[PDB]
Design an enzyme around this catalytic site. Structure first.
Site: not given
Ligand SMILES: O=c1ccn([C@@H]2O[C@H](COP(=O)(O)OP(=O)(O)O)[C@@H](O)[C@H]2O)c(=O)[nH]1
Ligand SMILES: OC[C@H]1O[C@@H](O)[C@H](O)[C@@H](O)[C@H]1O
Ligand SMILES: [Mn+2]
Length: 274
Positions: A65, A140, A232
């Site tokens: 990422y 994110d 979440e």
């Protein structure tokens, strides 16, 4: 103490004219739901610059990422809290892979090395954030800013409507449904399905949220259960029991490839990268 706003010339709000008739713009606990056309950003920018607001933005970029950081940060510089003080905190296992991104004045970046769900624990950096910023925004990394994301979002505690569920009835929400989990929500409960990828608030309220979700995750681990959507699911449980003071519309977390560009979204502000 808040000093007076200066004189300003702007269109009069007219009480017998709604801003937006197509959407809910206030929750039943009287938290604004932030859509384009509901705010005058010149009034908000005055209010927040008169308090010399500093906004922290946290992002995790672990393993592969790290590839998303250049576009994330470069588009943050174009669109996120421009004119305000910003402190980015990039949490990564590869400090040397963080791209060198040129920042506007009043903006800083810190690289915080971690070991490669644990975002909640890592956020709940407590002392540093309390000394360095007024609000924390937690997002994110596999995203880009395409349009304005500014001080209209700041409040003591906010969540963001998940773009796949804003039109759904609660029983379709993908809340954790097993009573054995701390994140459990029965089928007849729930206001919204909030996206784990964009929440925030004052540092105090964000440290409360991330501490409570971390503790609830540890309970579930001890009990051998992992919630259906991980942090979440816990964020949803928390926000059902602790109502946010603003809710961001799906302008603030969108996926154009999956969902297109419906008429109800006047702007697509922060979007998934393909
Ligand atoms: O190997 C990984 C997995 C996850 N993440 C961070 O955790 C966020 C949430 O995971 P992801 O975005 O993959 O979830 P998705 O949005 O695809 O369901 C990612 O944005 C990164 O911000 C990461 O940094 N490295
Ligand atoms: O149902 C909840 C899920 O919905 C997806 O669209 C999203 O990619 C997942 O991260 C999770 O939020
Ligand atoms: Mn993501």
């Amino acid at each position: 103490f808040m000093v007076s706003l200066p004189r300003m010339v702007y269109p009069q709000p007219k009480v017998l004219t709604p801003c937006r008739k197509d959407v809910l713009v206030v929750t039943p606990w009287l938290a604004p739901i932030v859509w384009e056309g509901t705010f005058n950003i010149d009034i908000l920018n005055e209010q927040f610059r008169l308090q010399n607001t500093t906004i922290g933005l946290t992002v995790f970029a672990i393993k592969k990422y790290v590839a998303f950081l250049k576009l994330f940060l470069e588009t943050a510089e174009k669109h996120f809290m421009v004119g305000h003080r910003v402190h980015y905190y990039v949490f990564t296992d590869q400090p040397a892979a963080v791209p060198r991104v040129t920042l506007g004045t009043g903006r800083q970046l810190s690289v915080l090395e971690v070991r490669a769900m644990r975002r909640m624990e890592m956020i709940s950096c407590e002392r540093r954030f309390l000394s360095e910023v007024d609000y924390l925004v937690c997002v994110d990394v596999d995203m880009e800013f395409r349009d304005h994301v500014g001080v209209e979002i700041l409040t003591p505690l906010f969540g963001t409507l998940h773009p796949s569920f804003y039109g759904s009835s609660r029983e379709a929400f993908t809340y954790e449904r097993r009573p054995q989990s701390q994140a459990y929500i029965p089928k007849d409960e729930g206001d919204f399905y909030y996206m784990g990828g964009f929440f925030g608030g004052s540092v105090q309220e964000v440290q409360r949220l991330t501490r409570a979700c971390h503790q609830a995750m540890m309970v579930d681990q001890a009990n051998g259960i992992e919630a259906v959507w991980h942090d979440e699911s816990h964020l949803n449980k928390y926000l059902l029991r602790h109502k946010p003071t603003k809710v961001l519309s799906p302008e603030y977390l969108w996926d154009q490839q999956l969902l297109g560009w419906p008429a109800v979204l006047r702007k697509l502000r922060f979007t998934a990268v393909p």
